[PDB]
Each structure stands twice: as C-alpha cells, then as structure tokens.
C-alpha cells in the first residue's frame, strides 16, 4: 500500500542521511530537514517529530 511507500521513503531518508553523514555533508544535510517537511504533513505527528529530533 501507500504506508509501505512512506515506509520505504522514510528508511530511504535514514540510509542517505547517514550516506550525507558519513561524506560529511553540512548544507545538504541541514536542507534536508527543510527537503522532508511537506512530506512530514502526510502522516503523524508523532513520527515526524521523532525523525526531526533524531536528524
């Protein structure tokens, strides 16, 4: 379904996020955060500020 694609989507935000980290990446990594934002309004609160505290 479409929770499975959000799912995927998010993982896929942890996996280059930590690829972003691991190159050392500051501006790509800071506007990802403001990247991701319009996605964060298609599902919980919860989850979403979960991912922004842990970016």
Same mark, same amino acid.
């Given at each position: 379904?479409? @929770? @499975? !694609?959000?799912?995927? =989507? /998010?993982?896929?935000? *942890? @996996?280059? #996020?930590?690829?972003? +980290? =691991?190159? #050392?990446? +500051?501006? /790509?990594? #800071? #506007? *990802? *955060?403001?990247?991701? %934002? ?7 609160? +919860? =989850? +979403? !500020? %979960?991912?922004? %505290?842990?970016?």
């Amino acid at each position: 379904n479409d @929770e @499975e !694609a959000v799912q995927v =989507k /998010e993982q896929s935000i *942890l @996996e280059l #996020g930590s690829l972003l +980290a =691991k190159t #050392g990446q +500051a501006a /790509e990594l #800071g #506007g *990802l *955060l403001k990247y991701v %934002r319009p996605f964060l309004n298609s599902i919980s609160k +919860a =989850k +979403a !500020a %979960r991912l922004v %505290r842990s970016l």
